[PDB]
Amino acid sequence: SMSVKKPKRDDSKDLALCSMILTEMETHEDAWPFLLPVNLKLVPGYKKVIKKPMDFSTIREKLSSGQYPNLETFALDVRLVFDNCETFNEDDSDIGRAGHNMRKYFEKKWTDTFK
């Protein structure tokens, strides 16, 4: 509350560390569904169904231009990628499996780096 603060957690390396995680996600062999924004002209249903599209290139540009206020807003966008993928793709599809794999990979790096 006013003039009553918990001890200051060091957040000075968060930007660098999120960038490192994102690099690892970009280079994963199952990243291909997620590297670029879904083409809303060429994929029926996507525009109407997926209210907030997100992809790794969009996260990378937000990250690089100071559009994440803190590491939690970064994780929310990464999770959005996978949540969108589950909304639009069957679990038993190459893309649906890719998204599960990537979400697992992310969540481990996230816990190991920050928790």
N, CA and C atoms as an extended XYZ file, in Angstrom:
345
Properties=species:S:1:pos:R:3:atomname:S:1:resname:S:1:resid:I:1 pbc="F F F"
N         0.902       -1.225        0.000 N   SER     1
C         0.000        0.000        0.000 CA  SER     1
C         0.894        1.214        0.000 C   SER     1
N         0.311        2.413        0.169 N   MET     2
C         1.113        3.665        0.283 CA  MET     2
C         2.306        3.684        1.251 C   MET     2
N         3.525        3.816        0.670 N   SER     3
C         4.756        3.803        1.487 CA  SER     3
C         5.039        2.358        2.152 C   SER     3
N         4.453        1.328        1.607 N   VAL     4
C         4.626       -0.083        2.100 CA  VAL     4
C         4.823       -1.012        0.929 C   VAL     4
N         6.101       -1.356        0.694 N   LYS     5
C         6.447       -2.156       -0.481 CA  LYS     5
C         7.135       -3.422       -0.136 C   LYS     5
N         6.739       -4.545       -0.780 N   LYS     6
C         7.506       -5.797       -0.789 CA  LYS     6
C         8.896       -5.527       -1.323 C   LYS     6
N         9.880       -6.331       -0.921 N   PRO     7
C        11.245       -6.206       -1.472 CA  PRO     7
C        11.322       -6.224       -3.046 C   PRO     7
N        12.179       -5.350       -3.628 N   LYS     8
C        12.316       -5.205       -5.118 CA  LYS     8
C        13.022       -6.439       -5.802 C   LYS     8
N        12.218       -7.378       -6.322 N   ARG     9
C        12.638       -8.365       -7.378 CA  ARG     9
C        13.417       -7.728       -8.571 C   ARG     9
N        14.586       -8.305       -8.891 N   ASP    10
C        15.451       -7.698       -9.895 CA  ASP    10
C        14.849       -8.095      -11.248 C   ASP    10
N        14.330       -7.098      -11.952 N   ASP    11
C        13.744       -7.286      -13.308 CA  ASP    11
C        14.614       -6.746      -14.449 C   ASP    11
N        15.853       -6.348      -14.144 N   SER    12
C        16.730       -5.663      -15.129 CA  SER    12
C        17.193       -6.537      -16.338 C   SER    12
N        17.215       -7.840      -16.111 N   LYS    13
C        17.555       -8.832      -17.123 CA  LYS    13
C        16.358       -9.489      -17.798 C   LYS    13
N        15.166       -9.039      -17.447 N   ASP    14
C        13.952       -9.726      -17.987 CA  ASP    14
C        13.886       -9.610      -19.515 C   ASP    14
N        14.156       -8.421      -20.034 N   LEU    15
C        14.109       -8.173      -21.535 CA  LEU    15
C        15.060       -9.099      -22.267 C   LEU    15
N        16.297       -9.183      -21.810 N   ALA    16
C        17.243      -10.121      -22.370 CA  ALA    16
C        16.894      -11.565      -22.277 C   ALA    16
N        16.403      -11.966      -21.135 N   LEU    17
C        16.012      -13.306      -20.953 CA  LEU    17
C        14.722      -13.687      -21.796 C   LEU    17
N        13.736      -12.787      -21.864 N   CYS    18
C        12.565      -13.076      -22.753 CA  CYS    18
C        13.014      -13.239      -24.239 C   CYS    18
N        13.977      -12.385      -24.647 N   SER    19
C        14.525      -12.434      -26.019 CA  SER    19
C        15.184      -13.799      -26.262 C   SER    19
N        15.955      -14.304      -25.284 N   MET    20
C        16.564      -15.613      -25.358 CA  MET    20
C        15.569      -16.733      -25.467 C   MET    20
N        14.548      -16.718      -24.618 N   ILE    21
C        13.479      -17.680      -24.740 CA  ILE    21
C        12.836      -17.654      -26.165 C   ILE    21
N        12.530      -16.476      -26.631 N   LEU    22
C        11.839      -16.300      -27.890 CA  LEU    22
C        12.717      -16.845      -28.999 C   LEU    22
N        14.051      -16.605      -28.919 N   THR    23
C        15.001      -17.191      -29.905 CA  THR    23
C        14.937      -18.707      -29.918 C   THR    23
N        14.814      -19.373      -28.757 N   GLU    24
C        14.752      -20.768      -28.647 CA  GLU    24
C        13.428      -21.273      -29.273 C   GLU    24
N        12.353      -20.526      -29.046 N   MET    25
C        11.043      -20.889      -29.625 CA  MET    25
C        11.129      -20.711      -31.177 C   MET    25
N        11.709      -19.613      -31.650 N   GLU    26
C        11.868      -19.364      -33.110 CA  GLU    26
C        12.640      -20.471      -33.856 C   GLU    26
N        13.598      -21.067      -33.190 N   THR    27
C        14.467      -22.058      -33.798 CA  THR    27
C        14.050      -23.495      -33.567 C   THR    27
N        12.998      -23.761      -32.813 N   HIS    28
C        12.481      -25.080      -32.622 CA  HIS    28
C        11.946      -25.609      -33.952 C   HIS    28
N        12.166      -26.891      -34.213 N   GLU    29
C        11.693      -27.414      -35.487 CA  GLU    29
C        10.156      -27.399      -35.694 C   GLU    29
N         9.362      -27.399      -34.621 N   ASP    30
C         7.938      -27.333      -34.688 CA  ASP    30
C         7.366      -25.873      -34.643 C   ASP    30
N         8.205      -24.901      -34.763 N   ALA    31
C         7.787      -23.482      -34.717 CA  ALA    31
C         7.065      -23.061      -36.009 C   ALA    31
N         7.276      -23.808      -37.120 N   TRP    32
C         6.796      -23.324      -38.439 CA  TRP    32
C         5.339      -22.841      -38.529 C   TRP    32
N         4.374      -23.429      -37.787 N   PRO    33
C         3.017      -22.834      -37.878 CA  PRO    33
C         2.858      -21.433      -37.311 C   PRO    33
N         3.884      -20.999      -36.533 N   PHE    34
C         3.774      -19.869      -35.584 CA  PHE    34
C         4.727      -18.735      -35.900 C   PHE    34
N         5.570      -18.881      -36.902 N   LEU    35
C         6.621      -17.912      -37.212 CA  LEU    35
C         6.102      -16.573      -37.739 C   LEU    35
N         5.008      -16.617      -38.492 N   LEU    36
C         4.430      -15.470      -39.160 CA  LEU    36
C         2.967      -15.403      -38.911 C   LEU    36
N         2.356      -14.208      -39.035 N   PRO    37
C         0.911      -14.094      -38.888 CA  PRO    37
C         0.138      -14.949      -39.906 C   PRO    37
N        -0.921      -15.547      -39.438 N   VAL    38
C        -1.813      -16.349      -40.307 CA  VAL    38
C        -2.325      -15.373      -41.387 C   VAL    38
N        -2.366      -15.839      -42.654 N   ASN    39
C        -2.808      -14.964      -43.774 CA  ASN    39
C        -4.370      -14.958      -43.775 C   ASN    39
N        -4.889      -13.848      -43.295 N   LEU    40
C        -6.324      -13.676      -43.092 CA  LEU    40
C        -7.106      -13.632      -44.379 C   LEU    40
N        -6.442      -13.317      -45.492 N   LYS    41
C        -7.070      -13.429      -46.824 CA  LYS    41
C        -7.142      -14.865      -47.304 C   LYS    41
N        -6.189      -15.704      -46.921 N   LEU    42
C        -6.105      -17.032      -47.481 CA  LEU    42
C        -6.568      -18.149      -46.610 C   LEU    42
N        -6.942      -17.880      -45.343 N   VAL    43
C        -7.373      -18.955      -44.434 CA  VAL    43
C        -8.766      -18.660      -43.983 C   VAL    43
N        -9.735      -19.329      -44.650 N   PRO    44
C       -11.140      -19.182      -44.252 CA  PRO    44
C       -11.387      -19.419      -42.779 C   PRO    44
N       -12.219      -18.581      -42.236 N   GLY    45
C       -12.689      -18.706      -40.857 CA  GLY    45
C       -11.810      -18.014      -39.845 C   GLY    45
N       -10.533      -17.801      -40.208 N   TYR    46
C        -9.552      -17.341      -39.168 CA  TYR    46
C        -9.857      -16.005      -38.606 C   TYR    46
N       -10.149      -15.073      -39.538 N   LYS    47
C       -10.431      -13.693      -39.161 CA  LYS    47
C       -11.589      -13.568      -38.197 C   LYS    47
N       -12.675      -14.256      -38.531 N   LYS    48
C       -13.870      -14.199      -37.665 CA  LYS    48
C       -13.794      -14.927      -36.346 C   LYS    48
N       -13.151      -16.080      -36.368 N   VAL    49
C       -13.062      -16.902      -35.231 CA  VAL    49
C       -12.022      -16.453      -34.212 C   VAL    49
N       -10.851      -16.022      -34.703 N   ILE    50
C        -9.676      -15.795      -33.779 CA  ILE    50
C        -9.606      -14.306      -33.543 C   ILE    50
N       -10.097      -13.935      -32.385 N   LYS    51
C       -10.337      -12.511      -32.146 CA  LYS    51
C        -9.026      -11.710      -31.974 C   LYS    51
N        -8.003      -12.387      -31.445 N   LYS    52
C        -6.694      -11.775      -31.255 CA  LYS    52
C        -5.575      -12.648      -31.831 C   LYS    52
N        -5.284      -12.518      -33.115 N   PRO    53
C        -4.175      -13.271      -33.735 CA  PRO    53
C        -2.858      -12.896      -33.102 C   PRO    53
N        -1.972      -13.885      -32.982 N   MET    54
C        -0.626      -13.618      -32.420 CA  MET    54
C         0.316      -14.665      -33.051 C   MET    54
N         1.568      -14.274      -33.235 N   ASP    55
C         2.600      -15.129      -33.843 CA  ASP    55
C         3.945      -14.667      -33.304 C   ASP    55
N         4.962      -15.490      -33.509 N   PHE    56
C         6.288      -15.197      -32.966 CA  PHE    56
C         6.911      -13.952      -33.549 C   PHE    56
N         6.726      -13.681      -34.853 N   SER    57
C         7.278      -12.437      -35.448 CA  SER    57
C         6.684      -11.142      -34.878 C   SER    57
N         5.421      -11.179      -34.535 N   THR    58
C         4.695      -10.099      -33.948 CA  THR    58
C         5.191       -9.908      -32.494 C   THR    58
N         5.359      -11.012      -31.780 N   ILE    59
C         5.929      -10.908      -30.410 CA  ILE    59
C         7.335      -10.317      -30.492 C   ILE    59
N         8.153      -10.803      -31.453 N   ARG    60
C         9.533      -10.332      -31.583 CA  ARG    60
C         9.545       -8.811      -31.838 C   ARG    60
N         8.669       -8.322      -32.670 N   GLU    61
C         8.646       -6.885      -32.983 CA  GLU    61
C         8.119       -6.068      -31.763 C   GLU    61
N         7.104       -6.577      -31.056 N   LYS    62
C         6.636       -5.939      -29.828 CA  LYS    62
C         7.785       -5.886      -28.783 C   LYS    62
N         8.492       -6.988      -28.623 N   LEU    63
C         9.609       -7.096      -27.680 CA  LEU    63
C        10.715       -6.074      -27.983 C   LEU    63
N        11.101       -6.040      -29.236 N   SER    64
C        12.150       -5.148      -29.694 CA  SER    64
C        11.762       -3.678      -29.634 C   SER    64
N        10.514       -3.268      -29.508 N   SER    65
C        10.087       -1.874      -29.625 CA  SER    65
C         9.454       -1.386      -28.307 C   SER    65
N         9.773       -2.113      -27.189 N   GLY    66
C         9.202       -1.698      -25.872 CA  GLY    66
C         7.766       -1.708      -25.662 C   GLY    66
N         7.065       -2.661      -26.330 N   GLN    67
C         5.645       -2.754      -26.181 CA  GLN    67
C         5.131       -3.798      -25.131 C   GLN    67
N         6.083       -4.483      -24.519 N   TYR    68
C         5.769       -5.282      -23.288 CA  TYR    68
C         6.158       -4.493      -22.003 C   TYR    68
N         5.147       -4.152      -21.210 N   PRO    69
C         5.505       -3.448      -19.964 CA  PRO    69
C         6.182       -4.318      -18.946 C   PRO    69
N         5.947       -5.629      -18.964 N   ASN    70
C         6.607       -6.486      -17.998 CA  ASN    70
C         6.626       -7.936      -18.547 C   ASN    70
N         7.354       -8.813      -17.874 N   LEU    71
C         7.508      -10.187      -18.409 CA  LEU    71
C         6.110      -10.939      -18.462 C   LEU    71
N         5.109      -10.601      -17.627 N   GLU    72
C         3.831      -11.273      -17.685 CA  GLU    72
C         3.047      -10.966      -18.966 C   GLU    72
N         3.167       -9.728      -19.479 N   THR    73
C         2.442       -9.395      -20.699 CA  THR    73
C         3.098      -10.186      -21.850 C   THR    73
N         4.400      -10.412      -21.781 N   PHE    74
C         5.128      -11.234      -22.782 CA  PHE    74
C         4.600      -12.656      -22.766 C   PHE    74
N         4.489      -13.246      -21.555 N   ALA    75
C         4.023      -14.661      -21.474 CA  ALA    75
C         2.568      -14.771      -21.975 C   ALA    75
N         1.747      -13.741      -21.717 N   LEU    76
C         0.349      -13.773      -22.155 CA  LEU    76
C         0.271      -13.879      -23.700 C   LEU    76
N         1.094      -13.101      -24.393 N   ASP    77
C         1.131      -13.189      -25.878 CA  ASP    77
C         1.663      -14.526      -26.371 C   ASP    77
N         2.685      -15.085      -25.707 N   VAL    78
C         3.208      -16.398      -26.143 CA  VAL    78
C         2.032      -17.424      -25.989 C   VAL    78
N         1.372      -17.402      -24.825 N   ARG    79
C         0.278      -18.375      -24.558 CA  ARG    79
C        -0.871      -18.190      -25.542 C   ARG    79
N        -1.170      -16.940      -25.914 N   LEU    80
C        -2.162      -16.612      -26.916 CA  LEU    80
C        -1.910      -17.360      -28.217 C   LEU    80
N        -0.646      -17.445      -28.653 N   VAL    81
C        -0.296      -18.193      -29.851 CA  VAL    81
C        -0.831      -19.638      -29.715 C   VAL    81
N        -0.614      -20.256      -28.554 N   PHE    82
C        -0.993      -21.649      -28.396 CA  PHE    82
C        -2.457      -21.893      -28.155 C   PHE    82
N        -3.077      -20.955      -27.494 N   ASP    83
C        -4.492      -20.949      -27.303 CA  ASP    83
C        -5.260      -20.733      -28.562 C   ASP    83
N        -4.778      -19.837      -29.406 N   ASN    84
C        -5.336      -19.723      -30.771 CA  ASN    84
C        -5.205      -20.985      -31.574 C   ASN    84
N        -4.050      -21.600      -31.468 N   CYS    85
C        -3.772      -22.828      -32.238 CA  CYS    85
C        -4.772      -23.906      -31.803 C   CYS    85
N        -4.960      -24.049      -30.490 N   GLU    86
C        -5.961      -25.093      -29.998 CA  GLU    86
C        -7.395      -24.769      -30.404 C   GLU    86
N        -7.720      -23.487      -30.483 N   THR    87
C        -9.074      -23.081      -30.938 CA  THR    87
C        -9.348      -23.515      -32.411 C   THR    87
N        -8.365      -23.415      -33.263 N   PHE    88
C        -8.521      -23.584      -34.681 CA  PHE    88
C        -8.111      -24.942      -35.273 C   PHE    88
N        -7.392      -25.756      -34.507 N   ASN    89
C        -6.776      -26.933      -35.071 CA  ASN    89
C        -7.132      -28.158      -34.197 C   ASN    89
N        -7.402      -29.265      -34.878 N   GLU    90
C        -7.603      -30.492      -34.164 CA  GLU    90
C        -6.277      -30.883      -33.428 C   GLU    90
N        -6.425      -31.442      -32.208 N   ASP    91
C        -5.269      -32.072      -31.472 CA  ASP    91
C        -4.495      -33.096      -32.327 C   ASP    91
N        -5.215      -33.925      -33.089 N   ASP    92
C        -4.613      -34.926      -33.961 CA  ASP    92
C        -4.437      -34.363      -35.388 C   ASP    92
N        -3.582      -33.354      -35.497 N   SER    93
C        -3.158      -32.734      -36.775 CA  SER    93
C        -1.716      -32.374      -36.548 C   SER    93
N        -0.963      -32.133      -37.605 N   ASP    94
C         0.419      -31.755      -37.447 CA  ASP    94
C         0.491      -30.415      -36.673 C   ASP    94
N        -0.362      -29.477      -37.062 N   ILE    95
C        -0.325      -28.127      -36.431 CA  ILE    95
C        -0.758      -28.211      -34.984 C   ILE    95
N        -1.817      -29.001      -34.701 N   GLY    96
C        -2.382      -29.136      -33.352 CA  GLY    96
C        -1.273      -29.744      -32.458 C   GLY    96
N        -0.569      -30.765      -32.935 N   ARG    97
C         0.530      -31.372      -32.160 CA  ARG    97
C         1.690      -30.409      -31.950 C   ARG    97
N         2.023      -29.640      -32.999 N   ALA    98
C         3.062      -28.631      -32.933 CA  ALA    98
C         2.741      -27.694      -31.802 C   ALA    98
N         1.503      -27.248      -31.720 N   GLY    99
C         1.169      -26.264      -30.681 CA  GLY    99
C         1.264      -26.774      -29.274 C   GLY    99
N         0.822      -28.018      -29.077 N   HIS   100
C         1.050      -28.646      -27.772 CA  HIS   100
C         2.492      -28.765      -27.418 C   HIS   100
N         3.331      -29.257      -28.344 N   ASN   101
C         4.784      -29.397      -28.144 CA  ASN   101
C         5.438      -28.052      -27.761 C   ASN   101
N         5.107      -27.002      -28.541 N   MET   102
C         5.668      -25.685      -28.289 CA  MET   102
C         5.243      -25.083      -26.952 C   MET   102
N         4.026      -25.286      -26.569 N   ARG   103
C         3.529      -24.778      -25.294 CA  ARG   103
C         4.296      -25.440      -24.134 C   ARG   103
N         4.433      -26.776      -24.244 N   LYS   104
C         5.317      -27.508      -23.285 CA  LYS   104
C         6.729      -27.007      -23.206 C   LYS   104
N         7.396      -26.810      -24.355 N   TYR   105
C         8.697      -26.311      -24.436 CA  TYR   105
C         8.816      -24.929      -23.784 C   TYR   105
N         7.856      -24.051      -24.104 N   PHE   106
C         7.831      -22.708      -23.519 CA  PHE   106
C         7.708      -22.688      -21.985 C   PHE   106
N         6.775      -23.488      -21.469 N   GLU   107
C         6.410      -23.424      -20.096 CA  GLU   107
C         7.585      -23.924      -19.228 C   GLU   107
N         8.305      -24.945      -19.710 N   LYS   108
C         9.542      -25.334      -19.053 CA  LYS   108
C        10.624      -24.257      -19.006 C   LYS   108
N        10.926      -23.624      -20.147 N   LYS   109
C        11.886      -22.538      -20.188 CA  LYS   109
C        11.436      -21.411      -19.259 C   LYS   109
N        10.125      -21.165      -19.189 N   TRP   110
C         9.591      -20.059      -18.411 CA  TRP   110
C         9.839      -20.301      -16.888 C   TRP   110
N         9.441      -21.468      -16.434 N   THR   111
C         9.661      -21.938      -15.052 CA  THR   111
C        11.129      -21.986      -14.713 C   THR   111
N        11.955      -22.586      -15.580 N   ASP   112
C        13.378      -22.668      -15.300 CA  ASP   112
C        14.098      -21.329      -15.272 C   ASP   112
N        13.663      -20.347      -16.074 N   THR   113
C        14.310      -19.060      -16.085 CA  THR   113
C        13.862      -18.144      -14.939 C   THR   113
N        12.586      -18.179      -14.584 N   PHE   114
C        11.960      -17.162      -13.725 CA  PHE   114
C        11.359      -17.665      -12.379 C   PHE   114
N        11.121      -18.967      -12.197 N   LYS   115
C        10.424      -19.497      -10.985 CA  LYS   115
C        11.315      -20.438      -10.146 C   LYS   115
